[PDB]
Write an enzyme that holds these catalytic residues in place. Structure first.
Site, PDB file in Angstrom:
ATOM      1  N   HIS A 244      87.102  25.712   1.068  1.00 59.47           N
ATOM      2  CA  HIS A 244      85.915  26.605   0.971  1.00 59.47           C
ATOM      3  C   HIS A 244      85.078  26.667   2.272  1.00 59.47           C
ATOM      4  CE1 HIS A 244      83.581  22.983  -0.240  1.00 59.47           C
ATOM      5  NE2 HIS A 244      82.710  23.562   0.592  1.00 59.47           N
TER       6      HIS A 244
ATOM      7  N   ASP B 272      90.957  22.777  -3.515  1.00 59.74           N
ATOM      8  CA  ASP B 272      89.988  22.881  -2.423  1.00 59.74           C
ATOM      9  C   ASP B 272      90.362  21.890  -1.350  1.00 59.74           C
ATOM     10  OD1 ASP B 272      87.849  23.745  -0.937  1.00 59.74           O
ATOM     11  OD2 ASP B 272      86.312  22.810  -2.196  1.00 59.74           O
TER      12      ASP B 272
ATOM     13  N   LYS C 298      82.581  16.439 -19.832  1.00 60.39           N
ATOM     14  CA  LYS C 298      81.386  16.515 -20.702  1.00 60.39           C
ATOM     15  C   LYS C 298      80.183  17.041 -19.929  1.00 60.39           C
ATOM     16  CE  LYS C 298      82.366  12.362 -23.526  1.00 60.39           C
ATOM     17  NZ  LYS C 298      83.301  12.987 -24.509  1.00 60.39           N
ATOM     18  N   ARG C 299      80.051  16.649 -18.643  1.00 59.60           N
ATOM     19  CA  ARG C 299      78.929  17.020 -17.777  1.00 59.60           C
ATOM     20  C   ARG C 299      79.001  18.444 -17.257  1.00 59.60           C
ATOM     21  NH1 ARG C 299      76.929  13.540 -20.553  1.00 59.60           N
ATOM     22  NH2 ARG C 299      77.435  11.353 -20.092  1.00 59.60           N
ATOM     23  N   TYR C 300      80.193  19.045 -17.286  1.00 63.18           N
ATOM     24  CA  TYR C 300      80.392  20.390 -16.770  1.00 63.18           C
ATOM     25  C   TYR C 300      80.955  21.321 -17.832  1.00 63.18           C
ATOM     26  CZ  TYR C 300      78.957  19.037 -12.041  1.00 63.18           C
ATOM     27  OH  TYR C 300      78.211  18.639 -10.956  1.00 63.18           O
ATOM     28  N   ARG C 301      80.139  21.588 -18.855  1.00 61.25           N
ATOM     29  CA  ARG C 301      80.497  22.516 -19.929  1.00 61.25           C
ATOM     30  C   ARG C 301      80.634  23.910 -19.302  1.00 61.25           C
TER      31      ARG C 301
ATOM     32  N   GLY D 178      76.136  20.931   3.373  1.00 62.13           N
ATOM     33  CA  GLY D 178      76.569  20.511   4.709  1.00 62.13           C
ATOM     34  C   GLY D 178      77.458  19.281   4.693  1.00 62.13           C
TER      35      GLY D 178
ATOM     36  N   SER E 197      80.101  19.021   2.448  1.00 65.85           N
ATOM     37  CA  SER E 197      81.422  19.451   1.949  1.00 65.85           C
ATOM     38  C   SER E 197      82.511  19.355   3.000  1.00 65.85           C
ATOM     39  CB  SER E 197      81.366  20.835   1.306  1.00 65.85           C
ATOM     40  OG  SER E 197      81.212  21.877   2.257  1.00 65.85           O
ATOM     41  N   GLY E 198      83.709  18.995   2.548  1.00 65.10           N
ATOM     42  CA  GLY E 198      84.843  18.812   3.452  1.00 65.10           C
ATOM     43  C   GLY E 198      84.972  17.380   3.932  1.00 65.10           C
TER      44      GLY E 198
HETATM   45  C1  LIG Z   1      72.311  24.202  11.647  1.00 68.35           C
HETATM   46  O1  LIG Z   1      73.535  24.143  10.868  1.00 68.35           O
HETATM   47  C2  LIG Z   1      73.406  24.301   9.541  1.00 68.35           C
HETATM   48  O2  LIG Z   1      72.348  24.458   8.970  1.00 68.35           O
HETATM   49  N1  LIG Z   1      74.637  24.289   8.960  1.00 68.35           N
HETATM   50  C3  LIG Z   1      74.944  24.364   7.577  1.00 68.35           C
HETATM   51  C4  LIG Z   1      74.019  24.209   6.544  1.00 68.35           C
HETATM   52  C5  LIG Z   1      74.436  24.255   5.224  1.00 68.35           C
HETATM   53  C6  LIG Z   1      75.769  24.504   4.897  1.00 68.35           C
HETATM   54  C7  LIG Z   1      76.699  24.712   5.942  1.00 68.35           C
HETATM   55  C8  LIG Z   1      76.276  24.629   7.266  1.00 68.35           C
HETATM   56  N2  LIG Z   1      78.051  25.037   5.656  1.00 68.35           N
HETATM   57  C9  LIG Z   1      78.491  26.159   5.044  1.00 68.35           C
HETATM   58  O3  LIG Z   1      77.743  26.986   4.531  1.00 68.35           O
HETATM   59  C10 LIG Z   1      79.990  26.334   5.034  1.00 68.35           C
HETATM   60  C11 LIG Z   1      80.522  26.736   3.646  1.00 68.35           C
HETATM   61  C12 LIG Z   1      80.202  25.750   2.585  1.00 68.35           C
HETATM   62  C13 LIG Z   1      79.626  26.014   1.419  1.00 68.35           C
HETATM   63  C14 LIG Z   1      79.256  25.019   0.354  1.00 68.35           C
HETATM   64  C15 LIG Z   1      78.579  23.750   0.921  1.00 68.35           C
HETATM   65  N3  LIG Z   1      78.259  22.712  -0.063  1.00 68.35           N
HETATM   66  C16 LIG Z   1      78.043  23.179  -1.449  1.00 68.35           C
HETATM   67  C17 LIG Z   1      77.653  22.011  -2.362  1.00 68.35           C
HETATM   68  C18 LIG Z   1      78.534  20.797  -2.102  1.00 68.35           C
HETATM   69  C19 LIG Z   1      78.368  19.663  -3.100  1.00 68.35           C
HETATM   70  C20 LIG Z   1      77.146  19.421  -3.723  1.00 68.35           C
HETATM   71  C21 LIG Z   1      76.975  18.311  -4.535  1.00 68.35           C
HETATM   72  C22 LIG Z   1      78.028  17.443  -4.769  1.00 68.35           C
HETATM   73  C23 LIG Z   1      79.232  17.676  -4.135  1.00 68.35           C
HETATM   74 CL1  LIG Z   1      80.530  16.523  -4.321  1.00 68.35          CL
HETATM   75  C24 LIG Z   1      79.418  18.772  -3.313  1.00 68.35           C
HETATM   76  C25 LIG Z   1      78.264  20.329  -0.685  1.00 68.35           C
HETATM   77  C26 LIG Z   1      78.232  21.416   0.362  1.00 68.35           C
HETATM   78  O4  LIG Z   1      78.211  21.129   1.551  1.00 68.35           O
HETATM   79  C27 LIG Z   1      77.424  24.147   1.781  1.00 68.35           C
HETATM   80  N4  LIG Z   1      77.311  23.877   3.067  1.00 68.35           N
HETATM   81  C28 LIG Z   1      76.157  24.529   3.478  1.00 68.35           C
HETATM   82  C29 LIG Z   1      75.600  25.163   2.406  1.00 68.35           C
HETATM   83  N5  LIG Z   1      76.407  24.916   1.345  1.00 68.35           N
END
Ligand SMILES: COC(=O)Nc1ccc2c(c1)NC(=O)CC/C=C/C[C@H](N1CC[C@H](c3cccc(Cl)c3)CC1=O)c1nc-2c[nH]1
Length: 238
Positions: free
Chosen positions: A44, A93, A160-163, A186, A188-189
């Protein structure tokens, strides 16, 4: 990372910061070194990324302030996204970045072991989520790499937590029932790293959640053990 603390330099030497260059340079996602030309991350992360030419991988970073125009990075030769990937919430993912050059291993940058197929039955009790993500829902990317210790949650309890979602065995969940510690925007990955028999294993890839660190909303991670054959298919191609 919500409810975490600053990492010490060299603590998570497989952790990378993936930056995008378009329109301006900024942190995009976390990732993990798994081989000398390979980063494992979330599919993603590449939403709207039309070329690997805009990507920069920085390893051996504790603080985002270490990154300037003169900071060395790894170029990306290829982005490999799982064929079955549609969206984070439906699984698959997972993505690989084939680096243009080889990572020279040292105490600041080295690979994390993938989980063993035989270790699909092992119970991990020492798991940590890391990243430069938000500390709260509306925040900013952190300078210092954060860490938070999080317990794994069974598939049954996570479902259970993600209906309304289908939590598959290709996903692994982690979180406290009362919330308070989790990944956030930020992160993620990046890795969910678990220590077993004095060895760190890449158990999960930070994927999605409902908000961040909410009570009864564990973080959902790509269950790396379920993709070991896929990773070897892509990295060990003849
Ligand atoms: C100056 O530089 C910045 O400001 N850079 C910056 C800021 C914010 C983000 C980003 C880059 N990257 C992107 O937009 C790329 C695409 C990703 C999308 C989903 C991602 N995400 C969604 C929720 C996810 C989660 C939550 C709770 C538990 C788990 Cl186990 C996972 C964690 C997560 O990083 C996310 N990353 C950002 C927003 N949302």
């Amino acid at each position: 990372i919500v409810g975490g603390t600053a990492s010490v330099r060299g603590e998570w030497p497989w952790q990378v910061t993936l930056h995008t260059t378009s329109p301006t340079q900024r942190h995009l996602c976390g990732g993990s070194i798994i081989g000398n030309q390979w980063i494992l991350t979330a599919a993603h992360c590449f939403y709207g990324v039309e070329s690997p030419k805009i990507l920069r991988v920085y390893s051996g970073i504790l603080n985002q302030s270490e990154i300037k125009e003169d900071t060395s990075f790894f170029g990306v030769q290829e982005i490999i996204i799982h064929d079955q990937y549609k969206m984070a919430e439906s699984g698959y993912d997972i993505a690989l970045l084939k680096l243009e050059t080889t990572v020279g291993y040292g105490d600041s940058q080295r690979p994390i072991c993938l989980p063993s197929k035989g270790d699909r039955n092992v119970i991990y009790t020492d798991c940590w989520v890391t990243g430069w993500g938000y500390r709260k829902l509306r925040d900013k990317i952190q300078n210092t790499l954060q860490k938070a210790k999080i317990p794994l949650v069974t598939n049954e309890e996570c479902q259970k937590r993600y209906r309304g979602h289908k939590i598959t065995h290709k996903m692994i969940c982690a979180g406290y029932r009362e919330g308070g510690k989790d990944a956030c925007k930020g992160d993620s990955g990046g890795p969910l790293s678990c220590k077993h028999n004095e060895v760190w294993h890449l158990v999960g890839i930070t994927s999605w959640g409902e908000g961040c660190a909410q009570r009864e909303r564990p973080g959902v991670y790509t269950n790396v053990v379920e993709y070991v054959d896929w990773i070897l298919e892509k990295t060990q191609a003849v």
